[PDB]
Design a protein around this ligand. Structure first.
Ligand SMILES: [Mg+2]
Ligand SMILES: [Mg+2]
Ligand SMILES: [Mg+2]
Ligand SMILES: [Mg+2]
Ligand SMILES: [Mg+2]
Ligand SMILES: [Mg+2]
Ligand SMILES: [Mg+2]
Ligand SMILES: [Mg+2]
Ligand SMILES: [Mg+2]
Ligand SMILES: [Mg+2]
Ligand SMILES: [Mg+2]
Ligand SMILES: [Mg+2]
Ligand SMILES: [Mg+2]
Ligand SMILES: [Mg+2]
Ligand SMILES: [Mg+2]
Ligand SMILES: [Mg+2]
Ligand SMILES: [Mg+2]
Ligand SMILES: [Mg+2]
Ligand SMILES: [Mg+2]
Ligand SMILES: [Mg+2]
Ligand SMILES: [Mg+2]
Ligand SMILES: [Mg+2]
Ligand SMILES: [Mg+2]
Ligand SMILES: [Mg+2]
Ligand SMILES: [Mg+2]
Ligand SMILES: [Mg+2]
Ligand SMILES: [Mg+2]
Ligand SMILES: [Mg+2]
Ligand SMILES: [Mg+2]
Ligand SMILES: [Mg+2]
Ligand SMILES: [Mg+2]
Ligand SMILES: [Mg+2]
Ligand SMILES: [Mg+2]
Ligand SMILES: [Mg+2]
Ligand SMILES: [Mg+2]
Ligand SMILES: [Mg+2]
Ligand SMILES: [Mg+2]
Ligand SMILES: [Mg+2]
Ligand SMILES: [Mg+2]
Ligand SMILES: [Mg+2]
Ligand SMILES: [Mg+2]
Ligand SMILES: [Mg+2]
Ligand SMILES: [Mg+2]
Ligand SMILES: [Mg+2]
Ligand SMILES: [Mg+2]
Ligand SMILES: [Mg+2]
Ligand SMILES: [Mg+2]
Ligand SMILES: [Mg+2]
Ligand SMILES: [Mg+2]
Ligand SMILES: [Mg+2]
Ligand SMILES: [Mg+2]
Ligand SMILES: [Mg+2]
Ligand SMILES: [Mg+2]
Ligand SMILES: [Mg+2]
Ligand SMILES: [Mg+2]
Ligand SMILES: [Mg+2]
Ligand SMILES: [Mg+2]
Ligand SMILES: [Mg+2]
Ligand SMILES: [Mg+2]
Ligand SMILES: [Mg+2]
Ligand SMILES: [Mg+2]
Ligand SMILES: [Mg+2]
Ligand SMILES: [Mg+2]
Ligand SMILES: [Mg+2]
Ligand SMILES: [Mg+2]
Ligand SMILES: [Mg+2]
Ligand SMILES: [Mg+2]
Ligand SMILES: [Mg+2]
Ligand SMILES: [Mg+2]
Ligand SMILES: [Mg+2]
Ligand SMILES: [Mg+2]
Ligand SMILES: [Zn+2]
Lengths: 64, 63, 97
RNA sequence: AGCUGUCAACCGAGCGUUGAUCCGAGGAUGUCCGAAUGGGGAAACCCGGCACGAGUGAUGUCGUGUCACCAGGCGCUGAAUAUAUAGGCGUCUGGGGGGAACGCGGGGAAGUGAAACAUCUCAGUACCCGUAGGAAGAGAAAACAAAAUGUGAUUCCGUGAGUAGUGGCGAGCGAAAGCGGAGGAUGGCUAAACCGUAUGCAUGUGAUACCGGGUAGGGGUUGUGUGUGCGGGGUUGUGGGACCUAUCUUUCCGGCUCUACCUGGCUGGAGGGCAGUGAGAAAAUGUUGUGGUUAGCGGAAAUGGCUUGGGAUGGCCUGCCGUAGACGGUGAGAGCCCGGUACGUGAAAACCCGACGUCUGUCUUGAUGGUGUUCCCGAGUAGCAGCGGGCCCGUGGAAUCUGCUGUGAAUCUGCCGGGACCACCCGGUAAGCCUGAAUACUUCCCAGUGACCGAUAGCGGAUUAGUACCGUGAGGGAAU
RNA sequence: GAGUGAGAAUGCAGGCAUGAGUAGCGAUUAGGCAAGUGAGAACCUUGCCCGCCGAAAGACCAAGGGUUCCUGGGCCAGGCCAGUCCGCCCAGGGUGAGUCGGGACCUAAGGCGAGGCCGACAGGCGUAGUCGAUGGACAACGGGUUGAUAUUCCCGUACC
RNA sequence: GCGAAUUCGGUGAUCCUAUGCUGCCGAGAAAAGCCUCUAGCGAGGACAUACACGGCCCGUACCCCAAACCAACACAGGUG
């Protein structure tokens, strides 16, 4: 839900915070999907792609 | 024992032909002898295989 | 830079008659990563839900071979952790009861 | 301007002019196995060391790195054993495996044919082994030729020619010279003899020594001898090179040239020349080019009438475009309905090309042809012999080339070849090395074409296809 | 210009006849009745009998198989008949270990094998090693529980 | 849900003591493990108590003299 653009003003530690918050979110809605009370399915994909985006930006910061 | 350790002279392959011109494959092997030569003037000896051509030409010092 | 957090290990809860019957005795079944061990699972479960975990028992289940006009295919091979919580009995309520 | 690959749709949700799906380029992530390489293993699954973090009350546990073996550089150490070596420790840099065909170097059948069969053939084939490259190999005369004041590195193609030959003169096999062409680079570089240097090994006459010389002084390139490296110098066939031998002497000056005076080389610097990613030593790098490749975009002209029809893209009649009447699709034969075609336009980035500069190197302390000798011109090599291989040539009178074994020279009034051999003539200059083009092939990608097949055909495979299935396994292998 | 003409190759493929509604329907135990279910019952469910095994035709494993196990549903193909049933079809579920059986312990026959030696090359053996149980070492017992696991879960008491 | 009595004997192993004992020739694995000794490491350390903990990976369903394995079959055969 957040463009990779506005992830470049965030430092390493707060990018890491964003990433762990997102991983916790993903665990929660994975449980909700398993128990049957998640109707919105595209939420899983968006959060999974957000995690991938956060790693991508971190690696780009490391290398250049 | 058919490769020289110095010049790599290996066997050659040809035919042994009988009186009935009955050719069979055989090998001309090199005349490699077990030499035990020195690399240093001092005289420490290491055992190798050297064809008699290399012995004759003095490529190995059996000091 | 990878970050490893506990939730990357446990994937789904097992929602079944037997799983609920164990829940009623304060024992929780999860689907876990196929390459985990009981020590890692215990640490992760204690770190996520903030409980004391007594025991973890693991089972490996092979995938069901299903037929088709093409032939056979196979499902995932999964492994499950049955986790027994301490006597304090602070329930875990992400299962729906 | 619609999208969430597909079989293969249904449900459940969503995204999209704030530019999604899609396409091209460069990147990131990239579990496990596999050369597989921390150790092990029944490939894809088991067990670790060390370092830095994480996490726990602590052990447990997690994350990221790193840890195979060989070969070669460099540094340290130098067993038995003294010199020392073999080895050991460390730090680097490579190697390993795969691949359809084409290349090169080796090993090498049998069925078969000979109307039997053994020489011979098949056939240097099939297969195997070692190695490549984008091509390879070959390549710059120790060649041909034949008395012509002749050709001139190699490779390939056509002939010569099924000829000369060869052959249990059986079945069979089978040239080259010459001649016509594709290409061009009749291309390059070393060794040696001498000169200088540096170092190593045996040495001092330890003293009148070396130095181009005369003068004077000191008194050691150890005097010397030798081997190796580096640089000059040379690079040849009418032989050439070196050593001394001769006239005119041409970019500036300085330093060296045992020492200082004048003279002989070597060396610096500013020139200028000439070349270069080349075979002729390489490397790095800028700048440019409406050069190419990897997505695309535009692109003229019929809603035409009448009629049959479910539907015109049929029939009849009208217009129109055409640098476009290629080919498809659209409800039946469409140049004017769609995609396109002819024809133009387009690249941020990456890659492949040239071109101009930095850069790199060389040449100029210097040129030229003469006049007369000594040295040099690739050594366990050539040649010779024995036993083989291969040449059209099956041992023949058997040259040329070549392997194993034995013996074993000369440096040019030499040595090799010209089908035994000898003499004379002619051609050439082995035992050192590089080398483009013309030639062979297609795993893969792009674009096309077919008097090619059209579902028992064409690939085994138009569909689950190397699938199902059969076999312990190599392997065999459908039908739709 | 031809992949140009079939009736024969114990020819190849496919479809279909003849035998023929014929043989067979796979042991040496053997079934019956009442009721139920259901469209349909010799074959399924329940009861009561009868019979067979009983050093097994019972109970538990290894190897091998691979979901065949349990629950719900099904009845086209398979079952040598029918089938409401099924080891068959479909969906969901089910396998819990410090002590069991292995590894993380150890080696045997053997395998591979750093360096190694041998061999034209391809390779052959092999040292140190390192794997390799069919063996050696090593700590848990009784009861209960599920439709489906049980020295594993729970209960009681232990041991390393 | 509640739940009685459970005492004496006889017989008796192919199972245990037993990796024993006795005979015999055919002359009957290895390694770890354990115990022990020193080399060595060493300023702390040994036994005990109590409490709190960690105990890893793989198999475990079902068949298994069988219509579930080897036999093309729901096969009169085979299977420790
Ligand atoms: Mg050898
Ligand atoms: Mg030969
Ligand atoms: Mg022969
Ligand atoms: Mg990652
Ligand atoms: Mg337990
Ligand atoms: Mg387990
Ligand atoms: Mg099924
Ligand atoms: Mg894209
Ligand atoms: Mg890409
Ligand atoms: Mg490994
Ligand atoms: Mg290995
Ligand atoms: Mg080294
Ligand atoms: Mg020494
Ligand atoms: Mg290779
Ligand atoms: Mg023959
Ligand atoms: Mg014959
Ligand atoms: Mg015949
Ligand atoms: Mg070419
Ligand atoms: Mg070449
Ligand atoms: Mg010819
Ligand atoms: Mg021949
Ligand atoms: Mg020189
Ligand atoms: Mg030179
Ligand atoms: Mg001449
Ligand atoms: Mg367009
Ligand atoms: Mg009409
Ligand atoms: Mg018309
Ligand atoms: Mg048409
Ligand atoms: Mg057309
Ligand atoms: Mg010469
Ligand atoms: Mg011959
Ligand atoms: Mg001859
Ligand atoms: Mg060459
Ligand atoms: Mg076909
Ligand atoms: Mg047809
Ligand atoms: Mg076929
Ligand atoms: Mg098979
Ligand atoms: Mg025909
Ligand atoms: Mg016919
Ligand atoms: Mg017929
Ligand atoms: Mg037939
Ligand atoms: Mg009939
Ligand atoms: Mg009859
Ligand atoms: Mg009858
Ligand atoms: Mg009958
Ligand atoms: Mg029967
Ligand atoms: Mg009845
Ligand atoms: Mg009886
Ligand atoms: Mg009995
Ligand atoms: Mg039984
Ligand atoms: Mg059943
Ligand atoms: Mg049926
Ligand atoms: Mg039936
Ligand atoms: Mg039923
Ligand atoms: Mg059933
Ligand atoms: Mg334990
Ligand atoms: Mg062994
Ligand atoms: Mg080796
Ligand atoms: Mg071996
Ligand atoms: Mg082991
Ligand atoms: Mg065992
Ligand atoms: Mg059971
Ligand atoms: Mg029990
Ligand atoms: Mg199993
Ligand atoms: Mg079990
Ligand atoms: Mg069981
Ligand atoms: Mg079993
Ligand atoms: Mg039966
Ligand atoms: Mg069967
Ligand atoms: Mg049977
Ligand atoms: Mg038996
Ligand atoms: Zn030799």
């Amino acid at each position: 839900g957040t463009t990779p653009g506005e992830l470049r003003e965030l430092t390493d530690d707060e990018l890491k915070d964003k990433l762990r918050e997102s991983k916790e979110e993903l665990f929660n809605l994975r449980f909700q999907m398993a128990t049957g009370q998640l109707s919105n399915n595209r939420r899983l994909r968006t959060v999974r792609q957000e995690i991938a985006r956060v790693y991508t930006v971190l690696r780009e910061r490391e290398l250049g | 024992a058919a490769v020289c350790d110095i010049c790599g002279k290996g066997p050659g392959f040809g035919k042994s032909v009988s009186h009935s011109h009955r050719r069979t494959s055989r090998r001309w092997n090199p005349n490699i002898q077990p030499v035990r030569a020195v690399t240093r003037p001092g005289g420490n000896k290491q055992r190798i295989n050297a064809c008699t051509s290399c012995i004759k030409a003095g490529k190995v010092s059996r000091a | 830079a990878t970050i490893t957090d506990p939730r990357d290990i446990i994937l789904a809860p097992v929602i079944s008659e037997k799983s609920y019957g164990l829940i009623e005795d304060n024992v929780y079944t999860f689907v876990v990563h196929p390459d985990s061990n009981k020590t890692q699972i215990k640490i992760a479960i204690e770190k996520i839900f903030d409980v004391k975990v007594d025991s973890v028992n693991t089972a490996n289940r092979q995938g069901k071979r299903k037929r088709t006009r093409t032939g056979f295919g196979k499902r995932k091979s999964t492994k499950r952790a049955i986790v027994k919580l301490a006597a304090g009995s602070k329930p875990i309520d992400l299962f729906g009861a």
